[PDB]
Amino acid sequence: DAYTWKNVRVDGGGFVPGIVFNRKEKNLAYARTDIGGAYRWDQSGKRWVPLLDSLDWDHWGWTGVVSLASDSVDPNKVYVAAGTYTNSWDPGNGAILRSSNRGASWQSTTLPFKLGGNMPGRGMGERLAVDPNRNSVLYLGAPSGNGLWRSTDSGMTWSKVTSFPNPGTYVQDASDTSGYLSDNQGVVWVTFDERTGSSGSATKTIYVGVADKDNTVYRSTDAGVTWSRVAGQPTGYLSHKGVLDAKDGYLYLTTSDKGGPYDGEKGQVWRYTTATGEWKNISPMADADTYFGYSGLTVDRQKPGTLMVTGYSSWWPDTQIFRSTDSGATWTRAWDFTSYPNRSLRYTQDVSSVPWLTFGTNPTPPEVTPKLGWMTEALEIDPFDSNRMMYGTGATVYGTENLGNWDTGGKIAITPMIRGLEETAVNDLASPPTGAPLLSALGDIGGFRHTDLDAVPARMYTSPTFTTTTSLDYAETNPNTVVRVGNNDSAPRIAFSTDNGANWFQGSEPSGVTGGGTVAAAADGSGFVWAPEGSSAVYHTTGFGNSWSVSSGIPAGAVVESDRKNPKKFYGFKAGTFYVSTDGGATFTARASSGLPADGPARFKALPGAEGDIWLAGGSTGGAYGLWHSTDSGATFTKLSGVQQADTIGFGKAAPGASYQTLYTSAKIGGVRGVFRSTDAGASWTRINDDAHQWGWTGASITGDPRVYGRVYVATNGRGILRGDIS
Ligand SMILES: OC[C@H]1O[C@@H](O[C@H]2[C@@H](OC[C@H]3O[C@@H](O[C@H]4[C@H](O)[C@@H](O)[C@H](O[C@H]5[C@H](O)[C@@H](O)[C@H](O)O[C@@H]5CO)O[C@@H]4CO[C@H]4OC[C@@H](O)[C@H](O)[C@H]4O[C@@H]4O[C@H](CO)[C@H](O)[C@H](O)[C@H]4O)[C@H](O)[C@@H](O)[C@@H]3O[C@@H]3O[C@H](CO[C@H]4OC[C@@H](O)[C@H](O)[C@H]4O)[C@@H](O)[C@H](O)[C@H]3O)OC[C@@H](O)[C@@H]2O)[C@H](O)[C@@H](O)[C@H]1O
Ligand SMILES: OC[C@H]1O[C@@H](O)[C@H](O)[C@@H](O)[C@@H]1O[C@@H]1O[C@H](CO[C@H]2OC[C@@H](O)[C@H](O)[C@H]2O)[C@@H](O[C@@H]2O[C@H](CO[C@H]3OC[C@@H](O)[C@H](O)[C@H]3O)[C@@H](O[C@@H]3O[C@H](CO[C@H]4OC[C@@H](O)[C@H](O)[C@H]4O)[C@@H](O)[C@H](O)[C@H]3O)[C@H](O)[C@H]2O)[C@H](O)[C@H]1O
Ligand SMILES: [Cl-]
Ligand SMILES: [Cl-]
Ligand SMILES: [Cl-]
Numbered sequence: 001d002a003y004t005w006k007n008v009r010v011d012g013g014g015f016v017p018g019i020v021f022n023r024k025e026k027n028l029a030y031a032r033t034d035i036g037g038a039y040r041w042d043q044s045g046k047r048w049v050p051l052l053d054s055l056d057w058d059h060w061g062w063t064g065v066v067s068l069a070s071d072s073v074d075p076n077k078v079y080v081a082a083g084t085y086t087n088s089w090d091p092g093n094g095a096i097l098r099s100s101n102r103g104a105s106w107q108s109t110t111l112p113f114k115l116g117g118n119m120p121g122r123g124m125g126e127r128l129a130v131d132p133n134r135n136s137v138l139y140l141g142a143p144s145g146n147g148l149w150r151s152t153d154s155g156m157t158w159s160k161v162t163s164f165p166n167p168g169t170y171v172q173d174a175s176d177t178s179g180y181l182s183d184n185q186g187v188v189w190v191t192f193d194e195r196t197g198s199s200g201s202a203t204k205t206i207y208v209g210v211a212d213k214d215n216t217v218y219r220s221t222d223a224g225v226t227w228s229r230v231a232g233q234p235t236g237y238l239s240h241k242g243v244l245d246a247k248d249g250y251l252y253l254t255t256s257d258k259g260g261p262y263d264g265e266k267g268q269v270w271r272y273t274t275a276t277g278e279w280k281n282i283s284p285m286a287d288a289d290t291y292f293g294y295s296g297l298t299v300d301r302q303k304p305g306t307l308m309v310t311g312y313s314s315w316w317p318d319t320q321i322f323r324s325t326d327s328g329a330t331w332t333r334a335w336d337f338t339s340y341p342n343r344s345l346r347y348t349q350d351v352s353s354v355p356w357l358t359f360g361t362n363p364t365p366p367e368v369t370p371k372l373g374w375m376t377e378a379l380e381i382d383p384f385d386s387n388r389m390m391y392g393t394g395a396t397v398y399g400t401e402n403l404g405n406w407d408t409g410g411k412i413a414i415t416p417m418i419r420g421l422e423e424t425a426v427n428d429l430a431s432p433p434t435g436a437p438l439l440s441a442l443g444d445i446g447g448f449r450h451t452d453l454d455a456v457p458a459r460m461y462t463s464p465t466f467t468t469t470t471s472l473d474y475a476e477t478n479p480n481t482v483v484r485v486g487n488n489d490s491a492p493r494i495a496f497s498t499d500n501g502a503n504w505f506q507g508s509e510p511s512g513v514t515g516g517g518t519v520a521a522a523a524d525g526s527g528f529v530w531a532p533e534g535s536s537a538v539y540h541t542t543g544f545g546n547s548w549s550v551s552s553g554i555p556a557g558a559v560v561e562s563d564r565k566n567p568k569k570f571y572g573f574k575a576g577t578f579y580v581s582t583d584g585g586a587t588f589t590a591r592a593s594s595g596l597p598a599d600g601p602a603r604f605k606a607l608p609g610a611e612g613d614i615w616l617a618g619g620s621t622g623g624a625y626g627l628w629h630s631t632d633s634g635a636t637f638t639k640l641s642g643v644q645q646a647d648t649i650g651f652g653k654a655a656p657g658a659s660y661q662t663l664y665t666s667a668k669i670g671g672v673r674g675v676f677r678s679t680d681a682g683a684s685w686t687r688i689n690d691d692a693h694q695w696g697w698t699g700a701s702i703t704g705d706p707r708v709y710g711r712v713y714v715a716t717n718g719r720g721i722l723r724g725d726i727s
Contacts, residue, residue, distance in 0.1 A: 001686075001710065001726045005693045007422040008438060008453050008713070008721040011354045013445045014423030016392030017123040017261060019378045020068050023132075023301065025075040026384040030103070031397065032065040034118040036423045036718030038080055040103050047420035050719065051103030052080075053693050057673040060696035061090040062097070062108075063718060064117020067128035073135035078103055079155050081128045083115025086144050087179030090114060096128070096140070098155040109156060113146045120172045121185035121211065123261040123295060123312070123377030124240045129190035133197030139224070141187030141208065143168075148187050148208060150224065164227050166218065170211040170238055172259055185211035185259045191242045191251075193274065196221075205274075207251060209239040211259060217242060217272075232279050234270055240295035240312070240377065247304035249274045250327055254309050256293020261375050264293025264313030271328050282328030284309070296321070296379035302386050310376040310391070317343065317366040319373040321391070323406055332406070334372060341366045346406060349398075349414045353456070356445065357396060357416065360462035372414075373398060390417055395445065397421065422720030426700055428471050429713050429721065431652075432479035433608070433706040435500035438713060440721055441469035441484065441701075449501040453723060464492050464506045470516030474500075475525030476564040476608060483528055485516040494519065494530060496544045507545025512536055520562040520570055522584065529570050529585035531560045538572065540585030554579045554588035561604060563633070565611040571634060573602055573616065578634045591634045599623040601699065603648045607661065608706065617646035617665055627665060629682065640682050644668045652704015652711060655679040664688075664712045666698040675702070675714060675724070688712065688724060695719050 015034055022028035029041040030051075037052030055062045064084030071077035083094025094115025097106045116122060127141030140149040140158070147167035151158045168188070173181035189209035197203030202223040207230075210216055216239040217230045237255035244251050251274055256267040267290065271280045283290070296310025305327050311320040321334040336344040343366045351357040351370050358369040371393075378392035381403070390399040399417035406412050428441035438450040447469040448457035461469065466486030475481040482497040484504075492506035493513050514534025521528055527542040529551060538551040538558060554560075554572045558579060563569035572579035572588055576598030579588040600620025607613040612633030619625035627646040628637040646667035654661050660681040667676050669685050675698070676685040701715035710726035 001688070003688050003724045004727045005689070005722055005724050007420075007719075008440070008450055008723050009456050010422060010424060010448070010720055011416065011456050012396035012418040012421055012423060013442065013720070014425070014718065015261065015375055015394045016397050016421070016423070017377055018068060018125055019380045019390050019392060019397070020070050020126065021380055021383050022070045022075050023072045023383050028070065028075050028102075030068055030070055030078065031392070031421060032068040032080070033423055033718065034064055034122055035084065035425070036716075037063050038065045038068055038103065039421050042420070045420075046417065048418070049103075049420060050422070051099075052097075052106070053695055053719070054106065054691060055696055056691075056694045057697060059092065060717075061085070061092040062095055063696045064090075064115070066115050066117040066119075066122055067126045067140075069126060069128045069130050069138070071130050071135050072132045073130075076100055076102055077130075077135070077154075079128060079130065079138065081115055081140060082108075082117065083111075084117045085180070086114040086116050086119060086183045089180070096138075096151070096155050096158060109158060111149070111158060113142060113144060116143050116183070119143070119183060120181060121188060121259040123375070124185070124188035124209070124211070124238070124259070127187060127189050129192060131197065131203050132192050132194040134200055134202045137202055139190045139206070139208075141190055143183060143186035145184050146186065161224060163225065164208070164218070166210050166212055166215055166229075168211040170213065170259060172263075185238075187211070189239070189242050191244055193244055193246065195246055197223075207242050207244070209242050211238050213237060216255065217253065230272065231277065233272075234268060234279065234281070237267055237293075240293070241297040243297045243299055243307075244274070245299045245304050245307070245327070248327060252297055252299065252307060252328070254294035254297040256295065256313070258293055258313070260293065260295065260312060261377050262313070266290055267293035269294050269309055269328065280328070282324070284322040284324075284331040284333070292320070295377045296391065298379055298381045298389075300381045300386050301383035306381075306386070308379060308381065308389070310379050312376045315374060317341070318368070318371050319376045319393075321372070321376070321379065325407060337366075345411070347372070347400075347412045347414050351416060354396065354416045354418060355456065355458050356448070356460050359445075360459060360465050423718055424720045425717050426715035426721050427469060429701045429703045429715055430472055430474055431703050431705045431713060432474045432500070435479045437705065437707070438721070439472055439474070439482065439501050441472050441486070443468045446486070447472070447484070461495070461501075461504060463504050464488070464495055466493070466495070466516070468516070471518040473519055473521040473562060475521050476523045476562075478525050481521065481525035483519050483521050485519045485530060485532065487515045493532065494545055505544070507541070508548070510535060510537075510539040510548040517557065518560050520560045522562060522567040522570075523564055524567040526567055527584050529560045529562070531556070531558050531572070533557065538585075538588075540570075542584070549586065551581065551585050552587050553590070554581075559602060559604065561606055563611055564606045564608045569611065569633065571604070571606065571614065573604055578616075578637070580634050592630065592637050595624060595639060596628060596637060597624040597626075600625070601647070603701070605649055605651070607651060615649045615663070617649040617667070619645070627667065627682070642669060642685070643682075644671070647699035648702040648715075650701075650703035650712075653706055653709040655709060662704055662709070664702050664704050666702055666714070675712065677712070695722060
């Protein structure tokens with residue numbers, strides 16, 4: 001069987017830090033994400049096309065894209081700087097990935113240091129740049145003290161620019177012992193002045209942005225041999241972007257007192273006249289009235305004099321977008337306070353195509369839902385259409401096709417431009433045997449009852465809303481009964497449904513909960529077992545969580561699951577020990593542990609229709625790793641000898657003429673990392689994905705479909721919910 005892969009339709013759901021239009025070819029554009037690769041625009045379908053799905057389990061870190069560059073001399077060429085963390089969370093050095101067919105296939109060169117696609121500062125840029133006159137020359141701004149790097153053979157080999165004098169100084173929080181907030185944000189954008197080269201000869205003037213409040217912009221005038229700070233530059237702020245209007249000879253800088261993308265409490269906008277050296281402060285608001293940093297910097301290539309910026313970190317009442325048609329001499333805004341706190345709008349916004357973007361809230365005026373945006377580091381005017389612009393938020397990409405209405409005193413029309421760009425971190429998936437085909441547990445946007453896998457759901461889970469759902473379950477014998485738990489600053493962190501997840505209601509909470517953990521539903525829907533994060537025990541309830549008691553004999557934070565057939569049977573796993581209860585979760589006892597994985601994560605599930613039939617996947621290179629099977633309710637497990645490592649396990653409808661339900665697993669088998677299917681209860685396996693469809697780390701969740709043979713739902717970490725079917 002050949003397989004066809006598509007997303008379950010959600011559209012967006014995470015941060016898009018950068019958008020890039022090609023300057024040579026109309027309608028050529030890309031987007032970069034921090035954990036989910038990169039995308040090419042499809043103008044015909046008004047949708048985004050993922051380009052980095054080939055990156056495998058062992059190269060998951062390359063799915064973080066800190067910068068992207070699209071060659072103006074040869075628009076077939078595109079380059080990405082790949083790598084996710086510079087601390088111990090990402091074991092792999094970063095890389096430059098190069099393609100000569102607009103992202104259809106890639107080659108890599110590994111750098112001798114790590115890159116920061118999901119680090120602080122990731123909305124500054126673009127820090128990877130191609131010479132617009134001799135396009136075999138590239139530059140890369142590097143983090144952590146590594147400075148400025150260069151290639152002169154179209155990105156195949158890289159070496160340090162030793163003559164660059166300042167590797168950056170800025171650190172968000174030096175005290176963070178995890179290394180996440182404590183890295184030097186380094187060299188953050190690179191911009192050529194294309195007027196200073198000619199075809200085949202290196203561009204002589206190069207501007208470089210540095211995360212150093214005392215020296216945020218450097219220049220070379222001799223094609224990168226020597227460097228100097230730009231004289232008279234403003235100090236006290238970090239330049240998130242540097243953009244050059246070459247027709248008028250203006251270099252623009254949007255600066256902030258923080259690195260972003262979340263923080264930023266002051267900032268400025270400056271204009272540097274390249275011919276004379278003059279600096280002008282063109283900030284849209286007075287400093288006393290500024291409570292955010294600036295970024296979102298873009299010039300209209302077809303109408304020099306026109307530019308826009310954002311107050312990227314304005315959290316209330318909304319983000320702010322600013323526009324000038326006179327090179328920063330005067331500005332107008334997407335909205336204005338009239339009689340404080342009431343507001344005037346210069347735009348309308350229609351999210352009927354992605355209805356869940358209201359987040360189910362009812363905010364107090366002057367706030368509205370959906371918001372104009374937030375975290376708007378990326379804002380771009382189409383170089384070939386003055387009436388189109390796109391910008392990124394923490395949840396979506398918004399755009400307009402009548403931007404000129406702004407200049408004639410009308411209102412611009414904003415809509416999501418996000419279809420195909422699937423960014424969610426998926427924690428858990430369920431495909432019950434009746435009702436909707438899928439229920440999702442997602443970071444940041446909660447999750448959905450998917451009534452139609454090919455349509456965006458109307459609304460995330462509400463009443464209560466969860467920031468993130470960590471685990472969900474349903475009653476095997478009545479899938480109208482559903483439970484979920486998740487993360488929230490305050491109670492409630494558990495919710496139930498009696499109508500298959502269409503409408504919810506909260507429960508009460510046991511002691512000390514700080515987050516979702518895992519949850520399990522009795523097979524008949526009569527009660528539940530909750531292993532929350534933070535709390536000092538596991539708890540069980542009869543009915544909908546009105547009264548909780550401690551589950552004795554199982555440790556806090558175990559993974560909990562329910563038997564599918566015996567309502568009184570529940571299971572737990574933690575740290576190499578399997579736990580069983582036969583009284584609804586009131587008491588557990590330690591059963592098997594012999595040979596079960598003691599180190600690393602695990603996933604396990606009981607089989608629909610079979611009491612005591614349990615499959616468990618997990619472990620790590622620190623100890624045992626693989627797939628185990630018990631048919632005696634966890635008294636003994638057998639390790640499957642031909643599965644070298646495994647991380648997830650799930651089930652779907654039996655094959656025609658098969659004794660047993662079909663198994664699906666994210667695993668390593670016969671030396672190959674991939675997604676595998678068995679129709680003979682794990683005696684043999686067939687790989688059902690392929691080297692173009694890998695999606696990095698898929699260790700969170702997998703399930704088949706009880707009603708559709710062959711179908712598999714694969715959780716990803718930043719590419720949404722992937723759906724495979726037999727072709
Ligand atoms: O994915 C979580 C999952 O990871 C499992 O490990 C996998 C995995 O690990 C990589 C790394 O992931 C971190 O979490 C990421 C998350 O994966 C992303 O989805 C998420 O993205 C955002 C994105 O940033 C937004 O821009 C976008 O809009 O939405 C998405 C989705 O929300 O980011 C988080 C990290 O968040 C921080 O960075 C991004 C910032 O935006 C964000 O503000 C910031 O959050 C702060 O986070 C810190 C975190 O400590 C804190 O909560 C602050 O309060 C908060 O504000 C994990 O954080 C990180 O640990 C993962 O690294 C690996 O950790 C493994 C386990 O380590 C522990 O156990 C072993 C022990 O030795 C260690 O000491 C101990 O820490 C470790 O084994 C592994 O080696 C590390 O790589 O992907 C690769 C795979 O190999 C890993 O197995 C993990 O097992 C599981 O439990 C779960 O956490
Ligand atoms: O009503 C209060 C309101 O007015 C003023 O009083 C106050 O000054 C304002 O701050 C406040 O606005 C609210 O501000 C907070 C930000 O808060 C702090 O930063 C500024 C400081 O002055 C202040 O002291 C701090 O407390 C916003 O919270 C953030 O919310 C967004 C998501 O909310 C948005 O999405 C839902 C929609 O309904 C909202 O309209 C919209 O604003 C979060 O963004 C998401 O974050 C995750 C990653 O998160 C994790 O990492 C960051 C960490 O802060 C967080 O705790 C972790 O969970 C990304 O994956 C998503 O891509 C991204 O969308 C911010 O994390 C969160 O800080 C309030 O939204 C705002 O109302
Ligand atoms: Cl269509
Ligand atoms: Cl119109
Ligand atoms: Cl985990």
